[PDB]
Each structure stands twice: as C-alpha cells, then as structure tokens.
Amino acid sequence: KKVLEEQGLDVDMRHIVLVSDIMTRTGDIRQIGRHGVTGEKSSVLARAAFEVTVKHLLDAAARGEREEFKGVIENIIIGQPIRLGTGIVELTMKPNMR
Amino acid sequence: SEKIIRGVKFGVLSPNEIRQMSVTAIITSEVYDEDGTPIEGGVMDPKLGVIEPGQKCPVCGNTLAGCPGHFGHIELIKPVIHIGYVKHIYDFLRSTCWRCGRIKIKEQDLERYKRIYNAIKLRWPSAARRLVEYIKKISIKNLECPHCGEKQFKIKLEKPYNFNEERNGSIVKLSPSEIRDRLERIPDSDVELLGYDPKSSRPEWMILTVLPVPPITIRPSITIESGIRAEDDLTHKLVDIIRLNERLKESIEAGAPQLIIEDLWDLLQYHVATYFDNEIPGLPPAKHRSGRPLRTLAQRLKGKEGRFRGNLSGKRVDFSARTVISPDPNLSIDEVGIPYTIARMLTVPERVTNINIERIRQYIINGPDKWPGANYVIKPDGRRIDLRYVKDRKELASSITAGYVVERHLVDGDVVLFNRQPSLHRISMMAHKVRVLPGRTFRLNLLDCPPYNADFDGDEMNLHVPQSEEAIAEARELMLVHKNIITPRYGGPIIGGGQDYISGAYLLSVKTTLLTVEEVATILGVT
Amino acid sequence: MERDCLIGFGTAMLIKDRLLDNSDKAVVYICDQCGYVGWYDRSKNRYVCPVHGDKSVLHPVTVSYAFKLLIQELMSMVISPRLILGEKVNL
Amino acid sequence: LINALSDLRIEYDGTVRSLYGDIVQVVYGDDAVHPMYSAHSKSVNVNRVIERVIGWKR
Amino acid sequence: DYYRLLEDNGVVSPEVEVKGGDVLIGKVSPPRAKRDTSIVTRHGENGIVDLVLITETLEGNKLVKVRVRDLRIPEIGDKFATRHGQ
Amino acid sequence: MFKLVRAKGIVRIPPEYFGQSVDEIAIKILRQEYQEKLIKDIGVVLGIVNAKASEEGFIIFGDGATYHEVEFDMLVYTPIIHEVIEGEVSQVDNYGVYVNMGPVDGLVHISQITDDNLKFDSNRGILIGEKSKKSIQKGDRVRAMIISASMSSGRLPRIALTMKQPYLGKIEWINQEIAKAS
Amino acid sequence: MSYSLKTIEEHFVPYSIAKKYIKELIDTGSSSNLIQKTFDYLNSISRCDEDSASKIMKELEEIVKREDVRAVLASICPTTVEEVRSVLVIDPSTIYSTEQIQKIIEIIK
Amino acid sequence: STVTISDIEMLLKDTEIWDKLLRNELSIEEAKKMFDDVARSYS
Amino acid sequence: MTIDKINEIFKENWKNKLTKYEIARIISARALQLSMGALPLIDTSNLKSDDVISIAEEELKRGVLPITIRRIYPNGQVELISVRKI
Ligand SMILES: [Mg+2]
Ligand SMILES: [Zn+2]
Ligand SMILES: [Zn+2]
Ligand SMILES: [Zn+2]
C-alpha cells in the first residue's frame, strides 16, 4: 500500500489484502512465481505453459502424474468452458409450458 | 457418442506399446530414389501419413482432412539413454543395490515407510514428497546392501549422460546395457515407494531399445517457389540416426575391433540425444547446410514462438480487423464507426426464423457488393452458396425458409469487440455497437479514450466480431461500454470530460452568460 | 492479455468463440481403453484404434487441433499421454 | 500475478475459494463489497446519504 | 484472366490499370515440366503501369523493370506535421 | 429367449418440439433412436412399449435442447445358449437348413440333423435320408437346439443349431420316438 | 443426442405374452416389417393364451427357482416326462417332482 | 524416530482422527482424548 | 451468525436476486434455442427489433420463461430460483 500510494496511484485495499492472503496461505511466505504459489498448482499443462520448459512434462511422465482439468488455463488450452462467471450457472427448463 | 476430456494420464512409453501401435518398420536410410517416389520403409513412407491434397492414405481410406498421422518405429540394436530421464536414472542407480535390486534399507523400517507413504500419498502430497526425499537421502549413503552386504560402490554422473562407477580401479564407465539390466531388477513396491508409478512408468523403459518415428503430418515438406523442396529438421536427424544404426550393425557381424564399436555407440547415442533436444549444455549444436543450428522436438515446444505460447495460450483468429483511429464526437459512448469496406467483408451468420425472414430476404437481394447485403447462404443440409456466382439472386431469396443460415454484412447495432494493446486491464477491450460511416478509419468517441489510453497521433486498434448467438449475447450483457463507466481499481469513473468539454462547461455555466431564444434553440438542437 | 481480459469479464462462451471455433477447431477419435487417437476408415465404415483394431469403441471429441499436435509431439518423445473421457450429461 | 491468482472465485457462501476447493478468505474483503460498486473504497458514504435526503434545505 | 495484360513478349505495357494479383511479367522456369514463376501485383494495391525498362546484365541475362504508380488524395486518417513538433 | 427390460437414460428434446407433451416426444425420440438397433450387452431391440420422462430438463453449453431423465420398458430378444426353441424351415440348400427364429433365421448344417448319411438338394428340393426315410420341406415345425451364438452387428443371424440330441426334431419325429421308446 | 441406457430389470418373457406385447406395440406404434414379421412367427408356434402362460409361469416358482427356464416351459409345453430333462441345461439335479410339473400343464393348457 | 518422520506420522494421525470424527464414528470427548494422546506422545 | 454476520447478510441479499452472470446465461440460452425453431412466448408483432437476442431480453423482462436456476452451495445445500413470474 505504501509503495503504491507514495507514487500517487489509487488502488483499493481489498486487492492488496487478497494478494497478502494468497502469499501466506501455507504458513510460510511464498513468492508468486515459479518456486511459490504458481509452482504449487496441481496442473501439469498450466505449469508447462507458464514455464515454457518441457522438463515438467518429462517429470510428470516419469512419475506417472495425472492431470484433471480443474483450473481455467488448461481448459482454455484444450478448448472447454471454464467455471467462472457464466460457467458457475446451471439451468433447468420445462419445455411443455407454452 | 460425443464425449469430453476429463483427464490426462502421463507415463513412459513401453517398447511393447511402441511396437504395437506402429504400422511399419523403418530400415532403409534412403529417402528418395532417382524418379522421386518414396521408398517403402524409409522416413517418407506413405504409410505414415498424407500431406498432399489429392493423395489418399493406405492405412486409412482418408484424405488430408480425415487422416491422422501414423507412427513407425526404428529398431535399436544397442540401447541408448533418454537424455530427458537422466536425473531419474541417476536416482534409481544411487539408491539401489546392483545384485538384488533393493532400496538398501532394512525391511523392518521399509515396511512401515511403505505403509505411511500409502496412507499419506493423496491427502498431503508435500509430506509424501518430503518422505520420499528423506528415504532417498538415507538410502544413498549406505555403502552396503542390508540384504547383501556386498560393499556398494558410489556412482558419479558426468554431464551430459556419462555414468562413472568408482570401484577398486577408481575408473570404469557404465554402458547403457548394464544400466538397463540393473534397473530391470527393481521390484514394483520399491519403485512405488520411491515416488514412481510402476505399472505406467517402469524404470528400465527410460533406456531406449525402440525409437518411435513421428508421422509426416507433423513433419511436412515446405513448398517453396524456388522449385526445391525443403525438409524439416526432424527428418534431417532421423536419417542420421538410421544411418548410424546401419553403420554400427554391419560392424558387429563383420569383425569386432571393440574400439570402433564403442566409438560408434557414442555417436548414435549423441544423435538420439540431440534429436530429442538440441542446445544440450556441453555439447555441439547440429547444422544441416548453412551452419544454422537445427530445430528439434524440444525446440518446437519452448520459446515465445513455440507450441505453447505461440499456438496454445495465444493464436491468430478469424473475423478480425486493424486500422488507424480518429475522433468522432457525434457517436454515442456505446458506438464505434466502421468503414464500408470492412462492413462488407466481415459477416455475421444469422439463422432464418419466421420473424426475420423478410429482412434476410432483402439482404439476399442485395449481393456481396451492396450494403447491407450478404456474402453466403448456407442450406439446411449444410452446403454453402457464393452469392456472387448466383445467376439470379431474386429467386434464391424467395426459396429460403426457416433453418437457412445467411452470412450478412455488418449493420448498425451489431455488437463487436474493440481493443487497444497493450491490454493492461479488462476494459482495454469492451463491447461496442456498430455504425457504418464513410471513411477508412475506426471512429471513436472522445469520452472513450481514457479507458483505452488512446490518442489521435496515429494509433491503431483491433476489432473482433463474435460469430455465435451465445457469444454475442454474453458480449452484449456483460461487456457493453456504459456498464463499465466505474473502474474496478477504485470506486471512480474512468469515462468523462476532456479538454474542450471542461472549458466549454466553464464558459457556459459562468454567471455572466446570457442567452436569447434563438441561441438557446441553437444550443439545444444538438441534443 | 486479451484472454485475461475475457476471463476477467467472465464470458465463457465468448472465450470459446474467440479461441476455439474461429482458429483451429477439430474432431478426434479416442479409444476408451488406452486413450490413443484413432481414425475413421471411411471404406469399411468402422472405427480403428492403432493398438486395438476393431476390438474397442472409439468416441469423437471436439478439441483444438494444436492440442492434438502437442499430443503427437509428446508421443514423439517417450511419453504416453492417455486421454480419459467423460459424459457431457449425467444422471 | 495472473498465473498466481487466476483460479480464485466468489462463492454463493460469500467465501473466496480456489477451483480446487482451498479457502482463501472466509468473506471477500471484510464486508463483501465490490470495489467497482464502492463509493470510492467506501461501502456507503453516510454524509452523501444525508445530503441526498436533506440537502435542499441545508 | 490473370495474363490478359501481358503483351506478345510477356510484359505489360505502360498506361495500363492493374489490380492486386495481376501478372506484370510472365516467366517460366526450368524443372528442378516447366514451372510458372511470374511476378504479380501485390495484394490490395491497385495502380497504373508507369515505366517498362528492358536491358541486359553483365553476364548477358535479360533484365526487366516495371514501375507502378498510385495516386494518393488526402483523407481522414492521414498524418501531417509542422516544423515545431506538432 | 424373449425378454422385457426396464431402462433409465437421458433423452434430448430438440427446441423445434417444444410446447407439447414431453412423454410423446420422448417416446418418439426413443423409437427413432433405438428401433432395430443392436445393443452389445442387452441384445437386439424390438421396440419401446411405454416411456415416462420428467418435466424438468437441464441445459448445457452450446445446445438449445433440454435433456430429460426417462424410464422406459423395452422388448429386447436374445437367444440364450443351451435352450430348446421351436421354429420353422425358411429355406434349404447345400448350405444347410435355415430355421426362422422370430426376427432372425437360425442356421443348421447338413452334418447335424440326423446321425446317419443323408443326401441334400435331391429331386424336388427335398432332403432324403437313405436309412432314415426322412423328408423335410417348407412349412415345417422343427424344435431346434442352441449350441453357439454371438452378436457383432456385422450379421445378425449367425446362430448355430443342433439336432443330434434325441427327443428333438420334427413334431412327428419326436412323437413316434416317444411312442416307440416305451 | 446423448444417452446413457442403464438397465435395472432383467425379467423373462415366454412366447405367449410376447405375442400380447408385440400386439400392444404394433397396433399403435405401427412399426416396420421386421416387428410385423416377428408377429407372424408367433401366430403359429404359440400354443397357449396370455392367462395360460401367466398361470404356468407363476405356479412353477416353487418347483424351480429360475425365471429363465420357466419362460421356455411356458412356450413349448413338453407335456411329457421323457423330454423335460432335454430342456434342462442346469447342472444340479431337480427333485423327483417332475411328474407334478406335467400335471400343472394340462390343468392350465 | 526422526523429527521429520515424527511430524509426518503425527500429521497423518491428526488427519485420521479428524476423518473419523467427521463421519460420526467418534464423539467429541473421544476425539479430544485421542488428540491429547497424540500430542503428548509426539512432543 | 452461522459463520459470520456478513455471510448471512450476503446470502439473504442474494436470496431473491439474480446476478448478472445468471441473466447473461439465461438470455444466451433462450436466444440460442429461439434461433433453433422455438416459438416465442410473447406477441412479437410490434417489437422494435426482430432478432433473437432482443426477443429473449423482452421475454426475460416480463416473466414468461419457464427456467429455473439451481444454486449449489459449497456445503451441499441446494437453492432453486424460478424466473417464471418469479
Ligand atoms: Mg498515440
Ligand atoms: Zn492415414
Ligand atoms: Zn543387495
Ligand atoms: Zn485402443
């Protein structure tokens, strides 16, 4: 907040609080990058896309990992709808009512 | 039945699987003979796949559209090390006995370690990783197998792929054959405890005995107007591997100097390792004709132009345009001005119902060259009709019914996506309503500039036309401009007055301004 | 970044329209036992899976073509990516 | 930041959770107020409400 | 219809309107049958043929140069500047 | 053997059939999608007799149709191995004798009608036994035996019959056999 | 058009009530020739009525505890003790109440 | 055993106790007693 | 106060109110199935625009749509909201 405010930039405090919460979730301070929050993600394809390296896929093949398509990036990569916004809504209809 | 993908299971490709899925066997190292037909059994065998528009595949009765590529296999007489699994083979070697194949830990503690790992593998993956690391650390530094007590020798790895024992002679190099034979002894339980899936990733499968041959669909030949075909680098490497496979096999059955055998075994392995990955640290790059380093399997996947960031995370799209922007104070904040040329090229596909049939008929009567018109008509069974090749467009209009699809020009009131790069926040791309105007520029209201950080110094912006009903409905409901006046960064309006607006407001609202009926009518006539 | 903007707005069908329908939409056939990509023979009117002959059933899946290219490039290396299928609608 | 935060969602509970189920915040922010609907970071400006009601005689 | 503008020697004539894709010089190459290596007007660039030049190189090969001109009238979207940075 | 199974599934109601009773459209779609269609684990379907569908249908992405849960009763028939079933002769040639078994036609070869030597495709197209004095022709009523059967949708009437077992054969052949047995 | 097609019941049907069901199917469904042809196949071989097949199938639950064999005993009517063992393809030996099975045949059929 | 192994085992035991309590196979008092026993035995 | 008072206020507020994502989803689904041959549930004789999305918007504004939103809460509880005349 101080770094942003001393430059005259107006950012709401809720975003900063969410970032602070995300970087201290595991009981230790973690970076948002490769060795932290991003690297703890449970998707092989998302990690291989963020880190354009191929060693992640080789490690997954060696250890026989399983990728389950729960995030948004992997579903976009393969081409299936995400579960944010309009993807959280589920509909039911009665066709007979004319 | 139509399904969806709900998971992907990774593993190491078994040689039995490599042979079973293969359609042929690559033995010949000659790609093309005098006339030009591909040799059966070479890298360009037509059995692998079809890349020609008029050719038909032998394996499947399908053309380029319906034919997926088919795999071949190269038989290796001497095993080689997969360079991508060296850090795993090293760990398997350092933490296992070379006589019975055990983790080199007392079975009393081994059983409870296995029980704990089986209990915690799924609920606390990090704890399981730490437990595996601890087991490996305490098993590497044993020096005597508890089941044998045979004075285990330490193993050192020399980059890139050289394994060196330290016996009483202090120097002896391990061939891939002995490495694979040692890795075959490990039981499934010991592999599972070390953190690997035994039924899908078996450690000796990392030592290659059979090499898959990529399909020609992923290995196309570039057609250059210079008249000479250029092949991709994958074939340029596979020919080298098959050459060395033939070059080394004849030596075994004809003589045995045992010094030229190992000087060729260290060249085939280099070729395979460089085919899997170029730019290996401490290894020379491979050129083909002009000293340009080759592009290999791992080079097609990394970088900003590679597979992932070039084709999977982002891609080029259809129905998009780019043009310079110019101001327009006569548009609404929801509107964007579009040239007549762009409106007649980009189209929106509208399905014919009983409520919009007359409007669509009038669109069809106008051709592709008069706005508002149409470019194509799609029949209910699914055949397209180019309206510029239609003898009479008045009779085709009368024959359309509900269920037809007409790709019509953009008209006033259509929803498009208008974007300026770099896209720093989400209101860098908003939904706008089309208005077609004379000119060759994208016209934008002056109050809409702050969200885009746009200017009229020669700037350019992008346009996108959604094509489906659901996409258009979402864009109209969630992305429209006036719904996004207040920015999410802070509770304030990002759309508002500029330079002439402020001074005009000051001059009008000052208390000395007096107006007559005619001046009031002139001022209010623009509203 | 444009994809991030679209995700931030929460438009799943707009994301699909931009990134799949208008770039590289494709259909592939997967064996339900091994998860490998088969083909339609178009002459004997049957589904054929490379390790499987006609002993299994293949299902069509709509996917990005670049993803199929990635799968084949992964099988070019010694990696076995098996696709696990599911139903669009359940009971 | 985008790759770190892309999987967070607001639930019908009012909770911030990941798409894998992990709870990040028990309630979004502290009052579950969107910054886009805020009165410049304020859920309600009470002085503005007073001015709305009795501003014509003050 | 893309070769309608060439003369009997395979090159277009001056004062002829051309559109994008029209062939200006006709050329066939030895096989590496003969292949077509003609040069066409670039996509979406109309104009008028301005000059045709035929000469020889040092080796003795024929060299042909064709100039195409396009009229530009100021329109909405064009850039102008002063000597003071505006 | 003729069976009657009850099934539960999902039926898709296209938007062009909205505004009318869900049961009628559901049974119509089921008939258009399951009539004369072989099922790997249940057998060849002979039609739908009644279906009950829920009035609530869920909507998915990219489709305008609604999907309803439906319960219906089928009339599947599958010939079970080792069963005694009556039949009628449909056609006889050098291939053998083709016995009609409901929708499909069973098959028996000349080597397994009677434990003797017989001549097929004789005069008037009648199979006559030299030492049995047996005549078989059209309109017969035979009581066949099932020995082996498999379904792959390539060719439905791939059923093998058996006649060597005593107390089986024509209705007249078995009647005289029973009378002379005692 | 997405379907699941899971099965819950596995009831067996003899020839007589199969005629009843296909008749109840042909009259309103108006199916193709294959369904209609199967009805012709049942116009001759069928020996009993729907009530007769029901009575014979329901009274043999105590004698034999298998529904499949009861559906073929309700369609053939062996009415003789010398060929029942030919119909039987079940390894365990039935008790010597087979003479009662024949008795139930004529009182119903 | 080792400190890391003791930590892993105590984490596993806490997980099992919580799972059993959440399935209504234990009461609150029994869960309290087992938690105290594990904490004291692994201190 | 189940977990907190703010959560109770949140769930009470969204009890009988539609979010913008639900409105967008309903309108898109209705337009998609209305372009496929469905019969409009309103007059559609004097409407300003005759495209499917406008008709879907007007059908949602005056409750005639027999559509139900199923909200699944993270603890498993299910809430049903009907847009047919509320
Ligand atoms: Mg600028
Ligand atoms: Zn093929
Ligand atoms: Zn040992
Ligand atoms: Zn298979």
Written as one string, the DSSP assignment of chain I is: --S-HHHHHHHHHTTS---HHHHHHHHHHHHHHHTTTPPPSS--SS-S--SHHHHHHHHHHTT---EEEEEE-TTS-EEEEE-S--
- Regarding whether F90 and F77 lie in a shared domain, the answer is no
The answer to whether residues B476 and B430 touch, using CB atoms and an 8 Å cutoff, is no
What residues are paired with B3 via a beta bridge? C87
Sole residue written with tokens 């006559």: F128
Report yes or no: B130 at the A interface, CB cutoff 8 Å: no
Q: Minimal Cα–Cα distance from B1 to chain G, Å?
A: 7
Residues of B in contact with D37 (CB under 8 A): 486, 491
Residue I75: which domain range?
A: 1-86
- Regarding whether F166 and F103 lie in a shared domain, the answer is yes
Parallel/antiparallel/unpaired status of strands F38-39 and F118-119: unpaired
**Dihedral sign from CA coordinates of A12, A17, A20, A21:** negative
The answer to whether residues A37 and A30 touch, using CB atoms and an 8 Å cutoff, is yes
DSSP F178: H
Alpha carbons B73 and I40: distance in angstroms, whole number: 60
Alpha carbons F57 and A91: distance in angstroms, whole number: 8
Cα H13–Cα H19–Cα H25 angle in degrees, nearest 5: 110
Determine whether the interchain pair D1/A13 forms a contact, defined as Cβ–Cβ distance below 8 Å.
no
- Regarding whether F92 and F49 lie in a shared domain, the answer is no
Nearest by CB: A58 against B85, B478, B491: B85
- Regarding whether F92 and F65 lie in a shared domain, the answer is no
Phi, psi of F91 (to 5 degrees): -165, 145
**Dihedral sign from CA coordinates of B165, B171, B174, B178:** negative
B148 is in an annotated binding site: yes
- Regarding whether F176 and F86 lie in a shared domain, the answer is yes
The answer to whether residues H8 and H25 touch, using CB atoms and an 8 Å cutoff, is no
The CB-based long-range contact list for G98-103 (8 Å cut-off, 24+ gap) reads: G100/G63, G101/G60, G101/G63, G101/G73, G102/G78
The answer to whether residues I49 and I31 touch, using CB atoms and an 8 Å cutoff, is no
Parallel/antiparallel/unpaired status of strands B335-338 and B429-436: parallel
Determine whether the interchain pair B486/D39 forms a contact, defined as Cβ–Cβ distance below 8 Å.
no
Measured from the Cβ of residue G3, the count of other Cβ atoms closer than 10 Å reads: 19
Among B184, E79, B356, F174, smallest CA distance to G86 is for F174
Sole residue written with tokens 């259809």: B318
* Number of independent structural domains in chain I: 1
Among F156, F159, F145, F144, smallest CA distance to F45 is for F156
**Domain ranges for chain H:** 1-43
Residue B325 CA: which ligand is closest?
Answer: 1
Ligand 1 centroid – CA B453 distance (Å)? 8
Alpha carbons B75 and I2: distance in angstroms, whole number: 67
Among G61, G85, G86, smallest CA distance to G74 is for G61
Q: Which region, left, alpha or beta, applies to residue D55 given φ > 0 means left and ψ of -120 to 50 means alpha?
A: alpha
Task: Examine chains A and C and say if they touch (3+ CB pairs below 8 A).
Answer: yes
Q: What single letter denotes the amino acid at residue F31?
A: R
The answer to whether residues F73 and F4 touch, using CB atoms and an 8 Å cutoff, is yes
What is the token pair recorded at B493? 């309006």
Residues 6 or more apart whose CB falls under 8 angstroms from that of B190 comprise B96, B101, B102, B103
Q: Which helix (H) or strand (E) holds B431?
A: strand B429-436
Sole residue written with tokens 């002894």: B185
In chain G, the DSSP E strands lie at 6-7, 11-13
The answer to whether residues B336 and B414 touch, using CB atoms and an 8 Å cutoff, is no
Alpha carbons B279 and B295: distance in angstroms, whole number: 9
**Domain ranges for chain G:** 5-48, 49-87
Among I8, I59, I50, smallest CA distance to I30 is for I59
Q: Is A97 helix (H, G, I), strand (E, B) or coil?
A: coil
Q: Give the CA dihedral B97, B99, B102, B108, nearest 10 degrees.
A: -100
Measured from the Cβ of residue E10, the count of other Cβ atoms closer than 10 Å reads: 15
Q: Is B462 helix (H, G, I), strand (E, B) or coil?
A: strand
What residues are paired with F74 via a beta bridge? F48
Cα B292–Cα B293–Cα B297 angle in degrees, nearest 5: 140
Q: What is the 3-state secondary structure (H, E, C) of D5-54?
A: HCCEEECCCCCEEECCCCEEECCCCCCCCCCCCCCCCCCCCHHHHHHHHH
Q: How many residues are present in chain B?
A: 527
What is the token pair recorded at G63? 């004698």
Residues 6 or more apart whose CB falls under 8 angstroms from that of A79 comprise C16, C19, C20, C25, C62, C63, C64, C67
Residue B453 CA: which ligand is closest?
Answer: 1
Alpha carbons D45 and D38: distance in angstroms, whole number: 9
Q: Minimal Cα–Cα distance from I30 to chain B, Å?
A: 9
Residue C82 CA: which ligand is closest?
Answer: 4
**For E29, nearest residue in chain B (alpha carbons):** B227
How was it solved? cryo-EM
The answer to whether residues B287 and B294 touch, using CB atoms and an 8 Å cutoff, is yes
- Regarding whether F76 and F129 lie in a shared domain, the answer is no
What is the token pair recorded at B362? 């009038």
- DSSP letter for each residue of E14-50: SS-EE-TT-EEE--EE-----EE--EEPPTT--EEEE
Among B256, B273, B246, smallest CA distance to B176 is for B273
Measured from the Cβ of residue E7, the count of other Cβ atoms closer than 10 Å reads: 11
In B82-225, the DSSP E strands lie at 155-158, 162-165, 172-173, 207-213
Report yes or no: F11 at the G interface, CB cutoff 8 Å: yes
Alpha carbons E19 and E45: distance in angstroms, whole number: 6
- Regarding whether F113 and F131 lie in a shared domain, the answer is yes
**CB crowding B196-234: b at 16 or more within 10 Å, else e:** bbbebbbbbbbbbbbbbbbbbbbbeeeeeeeeeeebbbb
The answer to whether residues B396 and B390 touch, using CB atoms and an 8 Å cutoff, is yes
C59 is in an annotated binding site: no
Alpha carbons A41 and D45: distance in angstroms, whole number: 40
Alpha carbons B469 and C13: distance in angstroms, whole number: 9
Report yes or no: G93 at the B interface, CB cutoff 8 Å: no
Nearest by CB: B196 against A57, A64, A85: A64
Phi, psi of E84 (to 5 degrees): -125, 15
Q: Which helix (H) or strand (E) holds B269?
A: helix B260-276
C49 is in an annotated binding site: yes
Q: Minimal Cα–Cα distance from G1 to chain B, Å?
A: 8
**CB crowding B408-427: b at 16 or more within 10 Å, else e:** bbbbeebbbbbbbeebebbb
Q: Give the CA dihedral B471, B476, B482, B484, nearest 10 degrees.
A: -30
What is the token pair recorded at F131? 């030492």
Alpha carbons B284 and B396: distance in angstroms, whole number: 67
Residues of B in contact with G2 (CB under 8 A): 1-2
Residue F119: which domain range?
A: 82-182
Determine whether the interchain pair C13/F8 forms a contact, defined as Cβ–Cβ distance below 8 Å.
no
What is the token pair recorded at B301? 């996947």
Q: What single letter denotes the amino acid at residue B153?
A: F
Report yes or no: C23 at the B interface, CB cutoff 8 Å: yes
Alpha carbons A33 and A24: distance in angstroms, whole number: 14
Phi, psi of B292 (to 5 degrees): -90, 125
Residues of I in contact with B362 (CB under 8 A): none
* Number of independent structural domains in chain F: 2
